[PDB]
Ligand binder design. Structure first.
Ligand SMILES: [Cl-]
Ligand SMILES: [Cl-]
Length: 321
């Protein structure tokens, strides 16, 4: 096998302004999917190798959390970094998070979450598959999620605080083995739209639909980069391109959904495929899938009932058919 080490700062964890459990990060670990901070270059070699080999593994995984504030200056928030073994959305609570492998961190303190291969091993004798075009379950691998609990307060003024709380650093070492010739996957899009208006549609037995304004950076990036939505029975045709969507904003709390998937959006991240034709006017529309495998298998989330928040969306191009 061939190895590749990499250490990078991923971004920052902000203050908790809602007093509820807030999601602040969802870090994909798959080598062709793993994400840099803007103008970061540490993971380029990892993506490159991920496109050249058919199987990958992690030898170790450290997430270092560096406080951006002093512990006596800011109070009332606990940070919880945890391992999502399969990169699968779930309906969890703070307590559920605590049932995962995880580390809690007090505001104003530093800490490092360290994981062993035992914790990170794939189903192929410890290995995972690299090619995100062809499978999810044996391919996607683990994720690091970060949440927070408790309204972040300035201790001097006993007021709401709103700055960054932690620097987030990831250190790992990917190993690769077996061959592939997939330059398809070297250019996957990873981006963010801070100005996206969003809505959800559906009726009993129909797919959950996500509408996004047709002029938005998100929308006009997805159309350009997705293949053409010509794939199929009593459903629309979808693009074969899957996107992971991550909504870290508290404004994601104002998104209503038809039953029974309000939990999935409330959870902050899910998968989508561009669907053909128009659904809401002036919008581009997507089917929503509660797992990556469901997206690849065209098994969309189906509503059971019926019933324009501008939010911010981190999105990741999952594949390149
Ligand atoms: Cl909760
Ligand atoms: Cl809870």
């Amino acid at each position: 096998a061939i190895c590749q080490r990499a250490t990078a700062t991923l971004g920052t964890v902000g203050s908790n302004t809602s007093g509820t459990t807030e999601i602040e990060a969802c870090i994909l670990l798959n080598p062709v999917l793993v994400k840099d901070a803007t103008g970061s270059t540490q993971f380029g070699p990892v993506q490159a190798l991920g496109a050249q080999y058919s199987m990958w593994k992690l030898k170790y995984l450290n997430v270092k959390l560096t406080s951006m504030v002093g512990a006596s200056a800011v109070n009332g928030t606990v940070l919880r970094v945890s391992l999502n073994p399969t990169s699968t959305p779930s309906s969890t609570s703070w307590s559920g998070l605590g049932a995962r492998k995880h580390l809690d961190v007090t505001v104003g303190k530093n800490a490092t979450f360290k994981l062993k291969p035992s914790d990170l091993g794939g189903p192929r004798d410890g290995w995972w598959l690299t090619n995100t075009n062809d499978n999810a379950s044996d391919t996607l691998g683990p994720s690091i999620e970060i949440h927070t609990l408790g309204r972040t307060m300035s201790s001097y003024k006993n007021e709401q605080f709103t700055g960054g709380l932690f620097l987030v650093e990831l250190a790992s070492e990917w190993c690769f083995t077996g061959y592939a010739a997939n330059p398809n996957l070297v250019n996957l899009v990873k981006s963010t739209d801070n100005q996206v208006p969003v809505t959800f549609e559906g009726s009993a037995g129909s797919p959950l639909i996500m509408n996004v304004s047709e002029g938005s950076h998100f929308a006009r990036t997805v159309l350009a980069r997705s293949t053409t939505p010509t794939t199929l029975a009593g459903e629309r045709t979808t693009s074969d391109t899957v996107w992971q969507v991550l909504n870290t904003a508290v404004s994601a709390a104002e998104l209503v959904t038809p039953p029974p998937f309000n939990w999935l959006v409330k959870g902050g991240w899910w998968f989508v495929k561009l669907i053909a034709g128009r659904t809401r006017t002036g919008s581009r529309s997507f089917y929503v899938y509660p797992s990556y495998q469901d997206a690849l298998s065209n098994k969309p989330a189906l509503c059971t009932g019926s019933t324009p928040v501008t939010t911010t969306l981190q999105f990741t191009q999952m594949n390149q058919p």
